[PDB]
Amino acid sequence: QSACTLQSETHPPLTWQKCSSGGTCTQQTGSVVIDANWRWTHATNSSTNCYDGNTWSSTLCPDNETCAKNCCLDGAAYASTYGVTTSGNSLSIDFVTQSAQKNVGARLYLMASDTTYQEFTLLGNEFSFDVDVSQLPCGLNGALYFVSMDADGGVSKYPTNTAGAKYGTGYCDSQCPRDLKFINGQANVEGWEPSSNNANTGIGGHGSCCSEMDIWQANSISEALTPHPCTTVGQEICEGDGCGGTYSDNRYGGTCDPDGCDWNPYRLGNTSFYGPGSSFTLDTTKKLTVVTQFETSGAINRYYVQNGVTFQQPNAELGSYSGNELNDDYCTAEEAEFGGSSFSDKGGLTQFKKATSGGMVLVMSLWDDYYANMLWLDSTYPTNETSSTPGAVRGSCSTSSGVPAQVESQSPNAKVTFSNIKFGPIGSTGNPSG
């Protein structure tokens, strides 16, 4: 796609801290950009929609190539249309925003400059952030994570994409998503099937795969830490049901692991750790600090801080695994006790280390789940299972929760706030900010 300028593109600014082994941190000035799927897509020469509701213009977009030539992405009114605001080191994303139309959530990338994404090399380093999840009920997900995106959002590889990172192009994740309207500088119109339950979305013949590090998938009831390996580390197109993942008929068909080696303290038996009010170890009505460390073994370690008190990832016992570090033993024992071979099939933490050793883009998103109502995160999944199936219960939310239409109508003012991002060598981020 090209880019148009009927509405101007000003990325909301956002600062964060780069910290050093020597114990100081210094401020970095970045900004955030909304993914292309949320944008208006129209004819380069007019205001005629290339994409409308959940279908494409059959004349403008008779095929992927022609569509991409005819069509541009335009600017975003971040606050008024998308409910996205920043203030210093603080980002907020509202759930439902009402302008001329209704908007649901946002997916945002951190920018290095107006035209390029910021890449972080995770291995050997740690990432710290503050989050307020108090306004996030069952069925919602305020997500902070990393994906192996190209810093330019695909421009150098596919010159028919001239919009780039500036317009939030290039997305890929471990689901090989097929809901994307542009992949590899072409439209996804060929094979498009509009969604049965979502007025604004559909599923194309192509998807976009890549490694994904889910630092934080969470609401006020449940939270999960999840690495997802792919046989191809970086962004790569996939064809139809070969994509695998959520958007395909067959989940395990493809090149990515869409399940991941997930760590959810509730799922692992400690139901007292994380939730709303004073009866939990971490009170989700208040802001909390989340620190995630990527040791060079490829294992992942985690601690939390709330009102000056530090808590490690809680100990979990699972088969012959015991401890709080997400390592090969945990992941192998998880597959053994909970089932599945997708993580080990795609190479485990070894394959995943190849992504953390390379550059990854920071994503911050707020979403509801039109596919499984977020039950896999905060409820019992599949829903026919009981507490007697190992790993079935992942939170305290009803199996009736998170119908998108319901939660959008009842909880339009839901929102997430991420703040005080700090990145550097392991051990460094608890030092005073610059």
Ligand X SMILES: O[C@@H]1[C@@H](O)[C@H](O[C@@H]2CO[C@@H](O[C@@H]3CO[C@@H](O[C@@H]4CO[C@@H](O)[C@H](O)[C@H]4O)[C@H](O)[C@H]3O)[C@H](O)[C@H]2O)OC[C@H]1O
Ligand Y SMILES: *[C@@H]1O[C@H](CO)[C@@H](O)[C@H](O)[C@H]1NC(C)=O
Binding partner selected for residue 421 from ligand Y, ligand X, Co ion, none, CB under the kind-specific 5 to 8 Å limit: none
* Closest residue to ligand Y using C-beta atoms: 314
Question: Tokens representing 10?
Answer: 């000003």
CB 242 within 8 A of CB 209: no
Q: Which of 120, 78, 74, 106 is nearest to 215 (CA)?
A: 120
Contact present, 288 and 305 (Cβ < 8 Å): yes
The site partner of 299 among Co ion, ligand Y, ligand X, none (C-beta below 5 to 8 Å per kind) is Co ion
| Beta-ladder partners of 91 | 86, 418
Query: From the CB of 338, what's the least distance to ligand X, in Å?
Result: 26
**Least CB distance from residue 148 to ligand X, whole Å?**
18
What does 37 bind: ligand Y, Co ion, ligand X, none (CB cut-off 5 to 8 Å by kind)? ligand X
- Rounded to the nearest whole angstrom, what is the least distance from the CB of residue 297 to Co ion in the complex? 6
The reply on whether position 311 binds ligand Y by CB under 6 A is yes
Is 299 a binding residue for Co ion by CB under 5 A? The answer is yes
User: Which of 376, 353, 51, 392 minimizes the C-alpha distance to 192?
Assistant: 51
Backbone angles phi, psi at 334, to 5 degrees: -70, -45
Nearer to ligand X, 104 or 176 (CB): 104
Between the CA of residue 349 and those of 225, 356, 360, what are the distances in Å? 13, 10, 16
Residues 2/162, Cβ–Cβ less than 8 Å: yes
Q: Which of 273, 418 has the CB closer to ligand Y?
A: 273
Site string for Co ion, 277-296 (x = CB under 5 A): ------------------x-
**Minimum distance from residue 276 beta carbon to ligand Y (Å):** 16
The answer to whether 333 touches 318, Cβ cutoff 8 Å, is yes
Residue list 238-277, contact with ligand Y (CB under 6 A): 270, 272-273
Q: Give the nearer residue to ligand Y in terms of CB position, either 281 or 396.
A: 281
Q: Residue 362: which of 308, 421, 426, 286 has the closest Cα? A: 421
Report the nearest approach of ligand X to the CB of residue 49 (Å).
6
Contact residues toward ligand X (CB under 6 A) are 37-38, 40, 51, 81, 103-104, 179, 200-201
Q: Which two tokens stand for residue 385?
A: 């299972």
> In whole angstroms, how large is the CA radius of gyration of the chain?
21
Q: Which residues bind ligand Y (CB under 6 A)?
A: 270, 272-273, 281, 311, 314
